C-alpha cells in the first residue's frame, strides 16, 4: 500500500540508490557476478602465494608492506568514493562544517567494512576493482602483525553477507551510517539525527519491500552496527602497531587524520 508518506520515502531510497551506484564504481551485484562466474569475462587473476602474487602485477619492499599500502591506497580511494556519496545525502552538506567532518571521520571506516563485504567470501577478496581476488589463506599467512589485519573484515563479512542485502538496501544503510548523531565531538546532533530518522524511515520500508520474508531483517541490520565498530576499533589497535614496528612505512595522512583521536 502506498501513501504519500511512503512515496517520499520510496522516492528517497531511489534518490539514494541513485547516487550509490553513481559515487561506488563496483556495486556488491558486479562483485556477486565476479564471484560466483557469471562470466566468462569477468574472471578474475587469482592471487595466493607468492609466485601468483608476483605474476598478479602483469594484469619494491616486503610483500606484506605491499600488500598493506596498496589496502591502504584502496582505502584513501574509498572514503573519496563514500566522501562523495555522504554529498548526496540530503541535508548532509547543509550541515555545519565541522560537523560533516566529523561524520566522514567516525562513518568511513565503518562503510568501508560494510562495502568491503560486498568484495568477500569466505574464501577471499576482490581487489584491483575486480580485476583480481587474495585469497583469505594468503592474507592471513602473512608475516605479523600483517597475518592478522583482515581476518576480523572476512567474519564480520560472511555474517553480514548471510543478511543478503543488495546494494539499494546498502545505498541507504550506509547513509544511516553516516548520519549518527552520536559521533565524538559533534557540535549540533539534533539536524543530524532529523535526517537518521528520516533514512531509518527509509531503510525500513526499504527493507520491508525488498525483503518481504526476512522477519526483523531490519532490526538484525542495525545490530551489525556493533560488530562495525569493533572491527574499526582493532583496526586502529594493529595499526598503532604497526607504527612502531615498521617506523620505515608510511601511513597516508587522509588515513592518519582520520584515525587520530578515535573513540
Ligand atoms: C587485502 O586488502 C586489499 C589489498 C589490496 C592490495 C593487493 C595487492 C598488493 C600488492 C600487489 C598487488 C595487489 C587491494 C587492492 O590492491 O585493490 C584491496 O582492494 C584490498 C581490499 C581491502 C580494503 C580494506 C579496501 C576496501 C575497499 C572497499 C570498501 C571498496
Do not use: W
Amino acid at each position: 500500500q502506498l501513501n504519500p508518506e511512503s512515496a517520499d520515502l520510496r522516492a528517497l531510497a531511489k534518490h539514494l540508490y541513485d547516487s550509490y551506484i553513481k559515487s561506488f564504481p563496483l556495486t556488491k551485484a558486479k562483485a556477486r557476478a565476479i564471484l560466483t562466474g557469471k562470466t566468462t569475462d569477468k574472471s578474475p587473476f587469482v592471487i595466493y602465494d607468492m609466485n601468483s602474487l608476483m605474476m598478479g602485477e602483469d594484469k619494491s619492499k616486503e610483500v606484506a608492506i605491499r600488500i598493506f599500502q596498496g589496502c591502504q591506497f584502496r582505502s584513501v580511494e574509498a572514503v573519496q568514493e563514500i566522501t562523495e556519496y555522504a554529498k548526496s545525502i540530503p541535508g548532509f552538506v547543509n550541515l555545519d562544517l565541522n560537523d560533516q567532518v566529523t561524520l566522514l571521520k567516525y562513518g568511513v571506516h565503518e562503510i568501508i567494512y560494510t562495502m568491503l563485504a560486498s568484495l568477500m567470501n569466505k574464501d577471499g577478496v576482490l581487489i584491483s576493482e575486480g580485476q583480481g581476488f587474495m585469497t583469505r589463506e594468503f592474507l592471513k599467512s602473512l608475516r605479523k602483525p600483517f597475518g592478522d589485519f583482515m581476518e576480523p573484515k572476512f567474519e564480520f563479512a560472511v555474517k553480514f553477507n548471510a543478511l543478503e542485502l543488495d546494494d539499494s538496501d546498502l545505498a541507504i544503510f550506509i547513509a544511516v551510517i553516516i548520519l549518527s548523531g552520536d559521533r565524538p565531538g559533534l557540535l549540533n546532533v539534533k539536524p543530524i539525527e532529523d535526517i537518521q530518522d528520516n533514512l531509518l524511515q527509509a531503510l525500513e520500508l526499504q527493507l520491508k519491500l525488498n525483503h518481504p520474508e526476512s522477519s526483523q531483517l531490519f532490526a538484525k541490520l542495525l545490530q551489525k552496527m556493533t560488530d562495525l565498530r569493533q572491527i574499526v576499533t582493532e583496526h586502529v589497535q594493529l595499526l598503532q602497531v604497526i607504527k612502531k614496528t615498521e617506523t620505515d612505512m608510511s601511513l597516508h595522512p587522509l588515513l592518519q587524520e582520520i584515525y587520530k583521536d578515535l573513540y
